[PDB]
Design a protein around this nucleic acid. Structure first.
Ligand SMILES: [Mg+2]
Ligand SMILES: [Mg+2]
Ligand SMILES: [Mg+2]
Ligand SMILES: [Mg+2]
Ligand SMILES: [Mg+2]
Ligand SMILES: [Mg+2]
Ligand SMILES: [Mg+2]
Ligand SMILES: [Mg+2]
Ligand SMILES: [Mg+2]
Ligand SMILES: [Mg+2]
Ligand SMILES: [Mg+2]
Ligand SMILES: [Mg+2]
Ligand SMILES: [Mg+2]
Ligand SMILES: [Mg+2]
Ligand SMILES: [Mg+2]
Ligand SMILES: [Mg+2]
Ligand SMILES: [Mg+2]
Lengths: 208, 292, 172, 33, 159
RNA sequence: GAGGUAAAGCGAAUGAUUAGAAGUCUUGGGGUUGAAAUGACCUUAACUUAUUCUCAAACUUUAAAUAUGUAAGAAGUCCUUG
RNA sequence: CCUAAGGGGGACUCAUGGAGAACAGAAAUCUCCAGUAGAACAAAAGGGUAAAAGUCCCCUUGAUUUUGAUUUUCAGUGUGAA
RNA sequence: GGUUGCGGCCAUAUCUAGCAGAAAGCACCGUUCCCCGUUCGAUCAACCGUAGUUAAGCUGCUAAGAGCAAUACCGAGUAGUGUAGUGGGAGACCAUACGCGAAACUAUUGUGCUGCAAUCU
């Protein structure tokens, strides 16, 4: 059925997504991208840990599913299912083709599988958790790394959870009333637009 | 339940029409067809007879188009008519004829084609085009620009058409839009057209209304009543005016009770001025503070 | 300025539209057109089906309905003649957000015209388009524009005007 | 009598069923049961 | 199967500009072209009559003929080892005066003005354009501007 | 002058796409109210709103580098008038 | 494939959504509001088009005659098309 | 300076919600004998300028407004890229040398200018 992944490791072709031009494409093996306590608020999980690509490469949907399962299983076994929120940050949108499934005549292949095209420094998996749960989550990602080809780095983020703010700028914007909850994420205050709506949405805004 | 339509993406991708199309004033299709000149007649302009009707005024202008904007050659307005002896009904079909005749005579005076190309001096309502004189300059050619106004047989724009044609301008046209055109029998009843040229329809309304509804006659034809103008002497008001229009078609501007500077100073008092950046910043700060 | 009690803000009927959507074409539609021409005194116009529906028994471009537009005093007279059948009692859910209202009679002989067995009885649809002075702005060719918010007709103003001018009830 | 007809303003040349006419989008007309 | 029709490959070249579709502003129809004028060619997709072929889109040439609604433009096209003179009939919607004429025609006037004044003053003036020359010597004052020392920064990760 | 490839974008159009949150169901069902009132409630699913993760050879507002058209005068410019 | 689905002129605005009107309901017809085109333009796809190139109406045969020039494919030959 | 007619560029001009508008203009507005067009004098045509009104249109102003426009010790000399090496690396790719050099983002500012003619407290 599946060829060894070495046959599809490199981004040799242009991106080949599902479209009105290729329609009989199978589904990706990965369907779930958010695991753990995905409904946790931003303040509950300050620590973010990334699995980062050191490769310009293609990762199959099968590898994404396997690594996701490995990390989830380990972290829920060691720290509990609600101690983290794991997010897979790459979606397989590139269709691989297979030819054999005469000779080189009419050799345009059929859809065979799906792969995500990742760059160098691209984040593959993100895990927001508490600080005390660092060594577990790292070990959860370090195992998931075995399911991937190429080199990946485990990098502890400078930022608060999945927010774009550092762990210090977030605290500054939080004690200043510029951050409100939005479920699992937050909304930040804007100094543009309707003044009354801005003031109503952020009542604790200590204006300067 | 339904999607809000006026999104920021709707405004971002919106292509506003031309400024004067969004005002609903210029038909740029027709304007392109009117203005564009044969490229081998290099800088020779096409001249338009712009005819516009307001609720109180008739505006007739002779215009040539340029890149920086249209340039007026001459202009005759209906409120100039009281100088020539027509004081009421400044939007008649006959007032349209008088304005067309006035603008034609004024333009020909400006050019110097007065003695040549006099026009139809004895208005009998016959269809006629200004024919060139052999061994002489061709008549001033002008094209009618009725703008957004609908083309109907009997419309007032073709009154200015007929007046300008009779005034000596060469304006290409056909007689099938004049009042008195029989569409079934494709000939022009020049008697009814001559009636319309000298206010015959208005005079007949005066006569027909006076003996049937005197109270409405008193309100509709007030100015005629206090001017002691009956139906039978309506025609002369136009008939003399034509002659007077031909006697001195030169433009006399209204003497201005105030100078340009006085007008500007008076008007500037009633014009709100934009707030300075600091003023609106202070307003925002105050509104924030009063929110606590 | 900007006075709500201005003379030109007066509500008044723009047009009354009488609709009979007989589902078929032929004798019944012709007699419905005769009924409309009798009531309004004007030649009505026949509407064609926009598309084919087997359930309703209509096909595209088949002449289905007939309608007529009346304006002025005649519209007012027909409107009060139809309100008599409604015994001067409309509902709060008869007035649109744009300030228009309508009702539907079920027999056209209740209006007060002679009954003929050959014609039969047709139901009828009444719709009144409300508007102040200056609506020509939205309908003229040159310099056509929109009407300002304060000058717009809405549901509450139309309901109050209907209650005042007819001493009728709007059943909320 | 004269017979004027309402003119066509739409551009849908196709002679087919129109948009948003699906079954099961309607409420229960017999909900009072 | 290959397709090599007249307008093949012009999907983006003949498109109107974003938020610039519709009617042509009439300064396009008020411009005056004389034989010998230099004009740029840019096909307007909304006027399909008198449209240039895609080769001439973006080319500049000499007007040789003026007709009712069009100009004839001379283009030199490489065909193998030489140039061939091409004569393209273009409606004026696809044509614009080349802005390189108005700059050079101004330098001609400026040179004429400078030359006549120098004769009046009995001196000389040089009218040839010059390329940018290396800059001369100079002294940099450090009052309020004492040199600030920079160093390469250490490596950090910002994710 | 021309261009729409690299890059970029997707809280910008088209198409694809992960997750919650707040609202409306009046034009979704189940259960529980209701003796019956479609008039509430618990729920999932729908949509709507402001967000969120990720994409496009046959998507795109933007948009390179390289390559490419023309010009840099005497067959030119100006003045007068055939 | 089309005597119009060619040509000219005029009038109108489309897809769709919301709120309303007897039977009438998710879909018949009427009314208003919103509506940058999300419609339509014979047929592939792309481009183009809003007081129009779309829809409807009126008049028509320029889909005519003569023979040259030019663009594309190009040998700068033919044919087709413009 | 206001206003009208005709415009050029075609949102710094558009959109939403409010407020104000002297003079003139424009506008709404009144009528149906006549030319004309409609199911409907609503649109279109004509007549009066007479009976009324700034309510709307229009114009201007307001908004930590949406959009749009411009700018930049904003991001970023980043991404990309022309040229080079018997450079690194198993490879994928990467660094360096001589050049060119974005977009998003961020911040700030602005919100029609103007030609001809006529007219006006
Ligand atoms: Mg094997
Ligand atoms: Mg390949
Ligand atoms: Mg073989
Ligand atoms: Mg026209
Ligand atoms: Mg382009
Ligand atoms: Mg053609
Ligand atoms: Mg591209
Ligand atoms: Mg391409
Ligand atoms: Mg790309
Ligand atoms: Mg971009
Ligand atoms: Mg997108
Ligand atoms: Mg035709
Ligand atoms: Mg056609
Ligand atoms: Mg037309
Ligand atoms: Mg050839
Ligand atoms: Mg050939
Ligand atoms: Mg061929």
């Amino acid at each position: 059925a599946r060829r060894p992944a070495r046959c599809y490791r490199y981004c040799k072709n242009k991106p080949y997504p599902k479209s009105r031009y290729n329609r009989a494409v199978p589904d990706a093996k990965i369907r779930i991208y958010d695991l753990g306590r995905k409904k946790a608020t931003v303040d509950e999980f300050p620590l973010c840990i990334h699995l980062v690509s050191n490769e310009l490469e293609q990762l199959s949907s099968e590898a994404l599913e396997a690594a996701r399962i490995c990390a989830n299983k380990y972290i829920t076994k060691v720290s509990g299912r609600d101690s983290f929120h794991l997010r897979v940050r790459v979606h397989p949108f590139h269709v691989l083709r297979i030819n054999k499934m005469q000779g080189m005549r009419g050799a345009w292949g059929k859809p065979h599988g799906l792969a995500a095209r990742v760059s160098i420094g691209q984040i593959i998996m993100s895990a927001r958790t508490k600080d005390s749960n660092k060594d577990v989550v790292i070990e959860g990602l370090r195992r998931a790394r075995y399911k991937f080809p190429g080199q990946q780095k485990i990098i502890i983020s400078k930022k608060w959870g999945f927010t774009p703010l550092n762990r210090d700028e977030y605290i500054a914007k939080k004690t200043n009333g510029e951050v409100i909850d939005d479920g699992a994420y937050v909304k930040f205050l804007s100094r543009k637009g309707n003044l009354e709506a801005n003031l109503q949405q952020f009542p604790n805004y200590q204006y300067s | 339940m339904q999607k809000e339509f006026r999104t920021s993406a709707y405004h971002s991708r919106f292509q506003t029409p031309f400024r004067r199309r969004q005002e609903g004033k210029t038909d740029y299709y027709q304007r392109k067809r009117l203005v564009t000149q044969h490229k081998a007649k290099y800088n020779s302009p096409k001249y338009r007879l712009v005819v516009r009707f307001t609720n109180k005024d008739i505006i007739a202008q002779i215009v040539s188009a340029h890149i920086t904007g249209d340039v007026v050659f001459t202009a005759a307005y209906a409120h100039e008519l009281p100088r020539y002896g027509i004081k009421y009904g400044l939007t008649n079909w006959s007032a349209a004829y008088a304005v067309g005749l006035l603008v034609a005579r004024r333009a020909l005076q400006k050019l110097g084609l007065d003695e040549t190309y006099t026009g139809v001096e004895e208005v009998e309502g016959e269809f006629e085009l200004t024919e060139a004189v052999e061994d002489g300059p061709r008549p001033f050619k002008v094209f009618l620009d009725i703008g957004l106004q609908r083309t109907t047989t009997g419309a007032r724009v073709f009154g200015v058409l007929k007046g300008a044609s009779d005034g000596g301008l060469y304006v290409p046209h056909s007689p099938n839009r004049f009042p008195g055109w029989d569409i079934e029998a494709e000939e022009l009843d020049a008697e009814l057209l001559r009636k319309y040229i000298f206010g015959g329809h208005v005079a007949e309304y005066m006569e027909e209304l006076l003996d049937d509804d005197e109270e409405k006659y008193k309100s509709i034809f007030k100015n005629y009543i206090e001017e002691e103008i009956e139906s039978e002497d309506v025609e002369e008001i136009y008939a003399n005016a034509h002659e007077a229009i031909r006697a001195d078609p030169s433009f006399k501007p209204t003497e201005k009770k105030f100078t340009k500077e006085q007008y500007k100073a008076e008007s500037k008092k009633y014009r709100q001025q934009k707030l300075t950046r600091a003023e609106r910043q202070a307003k925002v700060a105050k509104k924030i503070a009063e929110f606590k | 300025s900007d006075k709500s009690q201005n003379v030109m803000r007066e509500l008044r009927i723009e047009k009354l539209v009488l609709n009979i959507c007989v589902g078929e074409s032929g004798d019944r539609l012709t007699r419905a057109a005769k009924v409309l021409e009798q009531l309004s005194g004007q030649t009505p116009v026949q509407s064609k089906a926009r598309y084919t529906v087997r359930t309703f028994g209509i096909r595209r471009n088949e002449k289905i309905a007939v309608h007529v537009t009346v304006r002025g005093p005649k519209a007012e007279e027909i409107l009060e003649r139809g309100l008599k059948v409604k015994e001067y009692q409309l509902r709060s859910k008869n007035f649109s957000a744009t300030g228009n209202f309508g009702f539907g009679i079920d027999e056209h002989i209740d209006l007060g015209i002679k009954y003929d067995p050959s014609i039969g009885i047709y139901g009828m649809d009444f719709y009144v388009v409300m508007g102040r002075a200056g609506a020509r702005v939205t309908r003229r060719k040159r310099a056509r524009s929109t009407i300002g918010n304060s000058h717009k007709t809405n549901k509450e103003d139309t309901i109050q005007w209907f209650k005042t001018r007819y001493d009728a009830e709007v059943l909320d | 009598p004269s017979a004027p007809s309402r003119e066509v303003v739409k551009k849908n040349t196709s002679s087919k069923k129109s948009d948003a006419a699906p079954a099961s989008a309607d409420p229960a007309k017999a909900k009072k049961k | 199967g290959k397709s090599r029709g007249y307008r093949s490959g012009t999907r983006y070249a003949f498109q109107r500009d974003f938020k610039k579709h519709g009617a042509i502003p009439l300064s396009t129809y008020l411009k005056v072209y004389k034989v010998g004028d230099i004009v740029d060619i840019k096909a307007n997709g909304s006027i399909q009559k008198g449209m240039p072929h895609k080769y001439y889109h973006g080319k500049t040439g000499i007007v040789y003929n003026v007709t009712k609604s069009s100009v004839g433009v001379i283009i030199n096209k490489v065909v193998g080892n030489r140039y061939i003179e091409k004569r393209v009939n273009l409606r004026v919607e696809h044509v614009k005066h080349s802005a390189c004429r108005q700059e050079f025609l101004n330098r001609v006037k400026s040179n004429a003005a400078k030359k006549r004044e120098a004769k009046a003053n009995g001196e000389t003036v040089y009218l040839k354009r010059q390329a940018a020359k290396p800059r001369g010597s100079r002294i940099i004052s450090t009052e309020g501007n004492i040199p600030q020392t920079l160093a390469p920064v250490a490596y950090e990760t910002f994710i």
